[PDB]
Write an enzyme that holds these catalytic residues in place. Structure first.
Site, PDB file in Angstrom:
ATOM      1  N   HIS A   1       0.868  -1.187   0.008  1.00 40.34           N
ATOM      2  CA  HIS A   1      -0.024   0.006  -0.092  1.00 40.34           C
ATOM      3  C   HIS A   1       0.745   1.620   0.179  1.00 40.34           C
ATOM      4  O   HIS A   1       0.324   1.890  -0.339  1.00 40.34           O
ATOM      5  CB  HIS A   1      -1.047  -0.250   1.327  1.00 40.34           C
ATOM      6  CG  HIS A   1      -1.383  -1.237   0.809  1.00 40.34           C
ATOM      7  ND1 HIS A   1      -2.641  -1.346   0.051  1.00 40.34           N
ATOM      8  CD2 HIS A   1      -2.404  -2.042   1.689  1.00 40.34           C
ATOM      9  CE1 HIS A   1      -3.558  -2.525   0.157  1.00 40.34           C
ATOM     10  NE2 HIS A   1      -2.514  -2.796   1.015  1.00 40.34           N
TER      11      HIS A   1
ATOM     12  N   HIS B   1      -3.871  -2.934   7.496  1.00 39.40           N
ATOM     13  CA  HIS B   1      -4.654  -3.795   6.439  1.00 39.40           C
ATOM     14  C   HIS B   1      -5.373  -1.782   5.542  1.00 39.40           C
ATOM     15  O   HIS B   1      -5.645  -0.865   6.677  1.00 39.40           O
ATOM     16  CB  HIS B   1      -5.775  -4.124   6.331  1.00 39.40           C
ATOM     17  CG  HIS B   1      -5.360  -5.927   7.300  1.00 39.40           C
ATOM     18  ND1 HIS B   1      -5.165  -6.675   6.331  1.00 39.40           N
ATOM     19  CD2 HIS B   1      -5.902  -5.704   8.556  1.00 39.40           C
ATOM     20  CE1 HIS B   1      -5.379  -7.599   7.412  1.00 39.40           C
ATOM     21  NE2 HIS B   1      -5.570  -7.129   8.101  1.00 39.40           N
ATOM     22  N   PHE B   2      -5.548  -1.538   4.181  1.00 36.99           N
ATOM     23  CA  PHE B   2      -6.019  -0.936   3.819  1.00 36.99           C
ATOM     24  C   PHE B   2      -8.125  -0.791   3.451  1.00 36.99           C
ATOM     25  O   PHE B   2      -8.293  -1.931   2.774  1.00 36.99           O
ATOM     26  CB  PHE B   2      -5.609   0.030   2.831  1.00 36.99           C
ATOM     27  CG  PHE B   2      -5.854   1.254   1.560  1.00 36.99           C
ATOM     28  CD1 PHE B   2      -7.182   0.731   1.650  1.00 36.99           C
ATOM     29  CD2 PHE B   2      -5.243   1.764   1.989  1.00 36.99           C
ATOM     30  CE1 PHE B   2      -7.749   2.007   0.833  1.00 36.99           C
ATOM     31  CE2 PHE B   2      -5.434   3.817   1.184  1.00 36.99           C
ATOM     32  CZ  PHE B   2      -6.501   2.818   1.034  1.00 36.99           C
ATOM     33  N   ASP B   3      -8.971  -0.715   4.051  1.00 37.60           N
ATOM     34  CA  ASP B   3     -10.285  -0.387   4.237  1.00 37.60           C
ATOM     35  C   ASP B   3     -10.590  -0.292   2.673  1.00 37.60           C
ATOM     36  O   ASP B   3     -11.406  -0.901   2.413  1.00 37.60           O
ATOM     37  CB  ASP B   3     -10.787  -0.644   5.888  1.00 37.60           C
ATOM     38  CG  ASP B   3     -11.375  -1.422   5.265  1.00 37.60           C
ATOM     39  OD1 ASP B   3     -11.591  -2.662   5.634  1.00 37.60           O
ATOM     40  OD2 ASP B   3     -13.057  -1.573   6.351  1.00 37.60           O
TER      41      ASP B   3
ATOM     42  N   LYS C   1      -4.432  -9.773  -7.854  1.00 37.55           N
ATOM     43  CA  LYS C   1      -4.753  -9.089  -7.041  1.00 37.55           C
ATOM     44  C   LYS C   1      -6.100  -8.511  -7.721  1.00 37.55           C
ATOM     45  O   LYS C   1      -5.950  -7.558  -8.284  1.00 37.55           O
ATOM     46  CB  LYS C   1      -4.348  -8.550  -6.081  1.00 37.55           C
ATOM     47  CG  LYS C   1      -4.871  -7.955  -4.755  1.00 37.55           C
ATOM     48  CD  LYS C   1      -4.113  -7.320  -3.716  1.00 37.55           C
ATOM     49  CE  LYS C   1      -4.934  -6.547  -2.600  1.00 37.55           C
ATOM     50  NZ  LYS C   1      -3.784  -6.107  -1.561  1.00 37.55           N
TER      51      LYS C   1
END
Ligand code: RHF
Ligand code: RHF
Length: 124
Positions: free
Chosen positions: A12, A119-121, A41
């Protein structure tokens, strides 16, 4: 092995460019960050801000995560980001992506001690 924090940075973080290098950015970045190794991905966001500024979001606006956990945090300021989305015609291993630049508030999930993004939400 690779920590959750380091994995977030690999998947990210891209502080080097102010915005999406080019129309080719996602095609090059998804492969080089190893997000095309085992499968394409399907969607992934890169953040163009300093690591300290993204780590600081863990201290900012607490919001529900999409999975219903409570450990997500929305940046008070907008950040430079690039969204990568696999094209309809993308066929593994030749993963193909549309590259889109935005300035949005990011939402990250944070864990650990130290309390850092893992994490990237979402972006909003
Ligand atoms: Rh706003
Ligand atoms: Rh606003």
């Amino acid at each position: 092995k690779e920590t959750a924090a380091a994995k977030f940075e690999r998947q990210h973080m891209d502080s080097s460019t102010s915005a999406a290098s080019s129309s080719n950015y996602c095609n090059q970045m998804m492969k080089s960050r190893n997000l095309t190794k085992d499968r394409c991905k399907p969607v992934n966001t890169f953040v163009h801000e300093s690591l300290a500024d993204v780590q600081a979001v863990c201290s900012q606006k607490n919001v529900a995560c999409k999975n219903g956990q409570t450990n997500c945090y929305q940046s008070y300021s907008t950040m430079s980001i690039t969204d990568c989305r696999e094209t309809g015609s993308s066929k593994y291993p030749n993963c193909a992506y549309k590259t889109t630049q935005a300035n949005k508030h990011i939402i990250v999930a944070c864990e650990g001690n130290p309390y850092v993004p893992v994490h990237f939400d979402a972006s909003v």
